[PDB]
Amino acid sequence: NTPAKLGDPPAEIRRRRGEVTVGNLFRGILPGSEVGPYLSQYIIVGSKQI
Amino acid sequence: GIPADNLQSRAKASFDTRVAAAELALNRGVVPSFANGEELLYRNPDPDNTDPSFIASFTKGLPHDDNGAIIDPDDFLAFVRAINSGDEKEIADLTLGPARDPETGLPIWRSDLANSLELEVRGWENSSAGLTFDLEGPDAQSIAMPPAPVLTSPELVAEIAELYLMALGREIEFSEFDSPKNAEYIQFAIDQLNGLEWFNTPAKLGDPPAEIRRRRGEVTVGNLFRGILPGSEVGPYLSQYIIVGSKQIGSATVGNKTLVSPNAADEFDGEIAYGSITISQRVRIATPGRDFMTDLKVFLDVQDAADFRGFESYEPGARLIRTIRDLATWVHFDALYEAYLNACLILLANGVPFDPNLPFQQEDKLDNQDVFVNFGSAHVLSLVTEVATRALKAVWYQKFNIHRRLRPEATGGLISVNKIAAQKGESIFPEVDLAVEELGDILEKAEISNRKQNIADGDPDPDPSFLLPMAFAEGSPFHPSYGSGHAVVAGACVTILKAFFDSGIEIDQVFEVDKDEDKLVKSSFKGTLTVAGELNKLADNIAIGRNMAGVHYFSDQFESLLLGEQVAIGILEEQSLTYGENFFFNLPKFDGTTIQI
Amino acid sequence: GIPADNLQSRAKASFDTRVAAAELALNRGVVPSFANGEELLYRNPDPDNTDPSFIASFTKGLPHDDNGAIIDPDDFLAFVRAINSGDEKEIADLTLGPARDPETGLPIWRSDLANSLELEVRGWENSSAGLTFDLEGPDAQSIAMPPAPVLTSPELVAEIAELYLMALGREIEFSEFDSPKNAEYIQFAIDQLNGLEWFNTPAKLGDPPAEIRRRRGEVTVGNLFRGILPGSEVGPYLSQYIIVGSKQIGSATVGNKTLVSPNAADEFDGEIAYGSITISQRVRIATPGRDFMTDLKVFLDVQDAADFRGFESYEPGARLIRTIRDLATWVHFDALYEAYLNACLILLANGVPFDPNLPFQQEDKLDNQDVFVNFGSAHVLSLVTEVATRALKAVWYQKFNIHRRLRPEATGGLISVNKIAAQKGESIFPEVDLAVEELGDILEKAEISNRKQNIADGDPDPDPSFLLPMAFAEGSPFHPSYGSGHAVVAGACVTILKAFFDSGIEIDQVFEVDKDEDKLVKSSFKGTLTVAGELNKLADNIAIGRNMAGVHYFSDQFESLLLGEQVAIGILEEQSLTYGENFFFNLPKFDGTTIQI
Amino acid sequence: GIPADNLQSRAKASFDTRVAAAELALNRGVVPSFANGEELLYRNPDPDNTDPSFIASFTKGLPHDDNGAIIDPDDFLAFVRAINSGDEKEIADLTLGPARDPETGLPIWRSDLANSLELEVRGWENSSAGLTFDLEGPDAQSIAMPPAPVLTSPELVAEIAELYLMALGREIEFSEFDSPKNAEYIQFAIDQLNGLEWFNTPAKLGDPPAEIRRRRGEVTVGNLFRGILPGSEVGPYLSQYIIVGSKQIGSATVGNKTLVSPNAADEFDGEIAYGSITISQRVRIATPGRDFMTDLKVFLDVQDAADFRGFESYEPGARLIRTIRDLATWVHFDALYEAYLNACLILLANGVPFDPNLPFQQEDKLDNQDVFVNFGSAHVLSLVTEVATRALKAVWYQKFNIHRRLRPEATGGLISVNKIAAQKGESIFPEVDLAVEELGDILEKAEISNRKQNIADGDPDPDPSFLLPMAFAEGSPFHPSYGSGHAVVAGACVTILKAFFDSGIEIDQVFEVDKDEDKLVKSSFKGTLTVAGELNKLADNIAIGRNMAGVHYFSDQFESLLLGEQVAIGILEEQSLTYGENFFFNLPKFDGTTIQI
Amino acid sequence: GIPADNLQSRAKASFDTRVAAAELALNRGVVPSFANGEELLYRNPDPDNTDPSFIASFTKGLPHDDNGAIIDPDDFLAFVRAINSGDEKEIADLTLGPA
Ligand SMILES: [Ca+2]
Ligand SMILES: [Ca+2]
Ligand SMILES: [Ca+2]
Ligand code: NA
Ligand code: NA
Ligand code: NA
Ligand code: NA
Ligand code: NA
Ligand code: NA
Ligand code: NA
Ligand code: NA
């Protein structure tokens, strides 16, 4: 609920998280993780078949 | 075949070990040092003139005019050449001091005092030590201190304000910082500093990272005149290690029996057991209220190399450090690593355990091995002292070869000359206009204090003087302000001690100096202090002691502490190749993180 | 084209400098160390046995039989393997101390005293520090000490005789060596030693050159219990630097004016100015007449690792070193380089000039240069202390990896057991038959002294004991006799100070401790002492102090002094590559010649 | 001094370790690769022509005439130049495919089918990967495969005979090799092969050692279409690891308690526990009886780069490998190391112990150490997969840069064209006269089979065709026959698994696929199989699967298995320098001996 | 003459490639790793005790008291030594599990 402050370790600044929402609850912060469904397509979909 | 390594002769293994340490040091790479830009920024104000004035550079020793500016820019440019060359003849060819009398050969001073003493000049102290190599640790020139604050900066205005407040506060007793008798002055100091941008406004995104790290916020009685190393701002001002004695010979546990020294009480009266003899923590007592270089002519003489060393008066006897001035006296003459060797002696006498990540630290029934030469008392005693000269070489490079920052006395001189001229509608040293504009209340107190000093010194009707009063008759040493020899050595030595000892050990009883007598009293502090915290505080005490004497600014000290820590870390890393045992030093660093070496 | 050299980056120049120093050290070459042949010479006397006895080797800590011989030769052979390996597990696997009680886990001692204290064992002190490399100076293993005297030799009989005479003389005051009240004992000591071949017959052509150099002649009151370094045998027994204080803060010459410290008299009352605080030369006072390990059961327990450290009692207060015992106490607990750092602090406070072959030592009006980091106070303060651990590594290699000589207490134990058995017509430890045969008069005095001690310690009717009385409850440190940590550090540190200071400077006023009070008196000595002479004497004082405590022999100390001098010389040589200036250290060596480095 | 080695920085130790591995690889030396001599032996039959024909070289993709000989020898010579250069422009400049239509830009094919699909060309697959270096393992070019069999050799006649019998046997179920309904065909195959000199006559003294090692003897039902690695010829045709599932999550022993997965039966129905999900052993079902490239025009189009990839049809669903064709389908699309990763996952799920010569494999109460990153599951999972691409580079060098052997389809094409011409009294491709002469009975069955295929494909009255029917619409990959990507990877990967696991562990229950249903049944085999044997069998299964598809000959596969084993061994050897622990891999090699690495 | 490079044997080119990759990795330099300072910060709360508690360190496997703090600090200190050594005997000598 409070942002990092100038002078904090750069590693903390990069990984600090802000307001929790249903859309980000229990998610990671890599780019792409916070958009669309929680689970990656690659852990639920199958593939084109022979 | 089974992969293997091979033995070689001992002599080749020793050679290869030393080369591998040199290679480790080389492989760290090097970084440049950047100065703040002032040296060629400020120009001679004379219209017909194309020279820098060098007014923000250390020029102590070169001949100055009546305003404190050097007379001939070539004198400083030659000094810079000699600094980078180190050649003895080139050094001997410099101009040092003012014109001399043909008949006596003596310097002709401005002040009746210097002329009556027939003072000679003193010279620069190892102006090229920054060129010296070392067999161990980071090379002097491989590391850097960041640019010093500029004269026009909020940071410098804040620093010089602080130094005047320390000077005018020299008779304040540490144990009485928060006492009613000092409330008016202490609150004036707090309020004045809180009225300055550096302290009342935060750094902004984009400011230099070094500024962000060292910038200070709201001034309080709890942080007034303190450092910022972790531990310094908790509990009493003075480190335990600069006022307490130690356990004494005869106090021991022998199996199930406790023996008590017949001299046990000496521990609580400032006696460190020093082998079978003692060190007393009691400091010599400089004459209270007597400051120096409060007269412009005497000040200029000192700027022109007049050797006032040894001119102070003292009271009989000695006492545990009592006033701000006493900490200034402590750091006037201390022998290199003295504070930290003394802390080390206390830790050893009191049986504080070594870092438990070193070998052989278990009870001997388990490891069959006690420690002495390596990982024991003799080891730390050598290592804490040996780092000092390596740290000095590095800070000397920053002092003379890179930054050449003017000492606080010289800044005070610019402020005084500026203010005096402004009162007559003339602009001299506009570079310090902001400090003059913002520090009026402090400068008025300085003026009154200086007039009293100048009357004491035998001047029936002194000219107005806003000079920064010096605790020492000669003012600063004969070397530049940035960084500090004291502070770099503090940083290196306390790094060693924190690494070598179990520096998470908590202090059992906390003491302060008594308000009424020359003795120790139990502190009313009700938290926990650690060895590491108190070692940091000790470094801050010796470093700020220089500030309280009038000879360094806050930034000199803190940046020098960081430089010294780097030197000691690098020595430990290189030495790690020399041992067969499986171990490391755990070092809690000044930044709050730990490195395992 | 004109021949030239070329510049390279600072980082490469630093690397190349460190490599060049390593190459200089490598190019010195190395020498082997030779032991005296005893380790496999002496055999277990039991007829059905093919083991060495190791009786002349240091075996403190390994379990001994009722005669003081180790029980199991494998315990010593494993200890030797561990010394050469350094491996922590292998060290932890050794046998230390006697059988332990199944219920309590505690060692079962022979003596009621050790059992009543429930003493635990103490372990070897860095038994493999001789394997450690160093970033500077000669590698620990590159240099040598010559073979130690053998038990059957005239030299050893002389050494052990001297140590018993020192032990029985512990209450004699240095100031009263020539006083009528001491004439009987002093003349007995002199006559006894003069009755021994070592002192009354010269070396012969063909004898080892090391024996020739260290052999002593006629014993006199003027040389009794002294060392042989040049300077030690002239003037008072104790070096000025271990009894006098220094010039104090406030005494100074400022131009044409002389200021006098309000504390000036502290100089003559044993206070060294230590920066702005002080060191007291006054030593803690061990209980007069109380010696240790005079009972065989307690002695054997100590031989079996019983940790008696800290068991001594003291009188209240402190005094300038007064008796032989006081010098023993001084060296019981001194901190590494303490004596020499203290001498350095005296020389600095008193303004003794540095070696005039260093740069920048002229008046600054001539050279424009004062000294601090290099060639000044900070330089010597680090250099004097840093050499200590390098000297210790070298002597540790000789102690553990090469010679493993038994400590004097162990020799006294052989003598006592031998004599007691001989009185009952049995031969035990015939190796010390010559000492027993020649030292009858001294051993009779020891017997009487030991009976009194043993009665005082609570045994109403003690068995006869001819043990060498120890000044310390634990006797020697937990490391071998040859050489000495104290003496190697003395040799290295005083080498530094002699080189760094102008050590031809003559002493102005010579003091001694007063016969009647705890104060200094002007000596009646009429000749001239020099700084170098008094630094040598200081080294000999610390070194012989160990002998007077019962823990080293003459040869251990003298050969260790020479080893330390080599270490310090080598460090100076290697460091000489790091400086740009044109200079050298002039060093007057212990052999009377001078080396310029 | 005591001989020693020395430490250096970790970064230098890492560098030196990598260099030492490179030096170990360099110190193995290199061996040349010799081709069989055919490339310049066979000549264009045109009298006025001085060119080689390249008929026994891989020329798939270059334009061929109506007999399957390349039209322009320069096209192959340029392709060889491009193979040795690797330059992308030079590759792009080659001729690929036949003349193209001006208006559409499309290749003009011979067959109505290829034209109706408007097929484009496909290109060579990394024709210069044999130039690629690798950070680990033997360089691609440092090792060799021996010369391939020549078209005129007994070995080749035997190989091609076998491939036609496999093609015509594609619908036979493994479980039914010995069944009455298959007796006529199975006995025909056995008798035909036993009628060939390669199998019915032994090698003779003086023959190449590589021929002696790989030569096969009497064909039996028990060895028909099997490999010769040790273990392949015992028990059921298919390795356990390509039909059985594994222990499932939920089955476990916790102390004295046994837990049973609720899905435990999945183990015996072809489900491998793959982490917490599953792999099914059931393979997709290519349309039974449908083969490809049985028409000369379609065959030539494929020889001219027509991209038929993806043209096959399948039945719905999946089944445990049932027929010869199913094993061909399995190897049509398998992902690199898939078979061996799957075997590894079975071994891990089933708890098969690691090689007991690795560290830490004891119960943790004894060694305090479990395994994962090194010497455990993660280690083998990376190592088994990483060897694949290193093995591929080496076999690609043999494929393209050294041997360029024609794929079996091309040999079948020479045989068909020869036989058709001979029936009209013309001699074409006399190089394959011996195969034509000796394989009449097999070729007659192929003719009948091909007519049926060609009718099914829509040609009501097809020309006679003796082409080798392909399991895959596109026939071989776009790279030469000798060696095999599948087989070299099999050799490398199973070498890793045999070394990493305790591959002497015996298989408890042996399964086969049921004759009547899509399920596993207990085998009636009596005898013992081991993990190593079944891993060898798995390698032989994947390798022969390519033969059964029509795309490799026996010699390609066996010689590739040996090459891959060398690659994996070399990687293990070089990696052995990276670990501190004391251990080795025990590897049972394909030749029956064991190497400890 | 025209500037050129030169060929060498394949085996030397392979060696030189692998050395060049090692040199590339070496030339990246290295950085230290800093821990958070807790390991020697937190102390055993017992008044007569000068040991760290190691309560914020991973000590799974070492014997713990009824509160979850390790019983003997030497067990964690030995574990740390074994971690830095890798020697199998030293690892086997640790204390693992309860009495
Ligand atoms: Ca221990
Ligand atoms: Ca000078
Ligand atoms: Ca295990
Ligand atoms: Na301690
Ligand atoms: Na710590
Ligand atoms: Na505590
Ligand atoms: Na014997
Ligand atoms: Na001093
Ligand atoms: Na001298
Ligand atoms: Na699995
Ligand atoms: Na195996």
From Swiss-Prot, chain E:
Look up the signal peptide feature and give its range. Answer: none
| Spans traversing the lipid bilayer | none
Q: Identify its protein family.
A: Belongs to the vanadium-dependent haloperoxidase family.
The protein's job, in short, is: Catalyzes the halogenation of organic substrates in the presence of hydrogen peroxide.
Partners and quaternary state?
A: Homododecamer.
> What is the protein name for this chain?
Vanadium-dependent bromoperoxidase
Originating organism: Corallina pilulifera
Question: What fragment of the whole protein does this chain represent?
Answer: 2 to 100 of 598
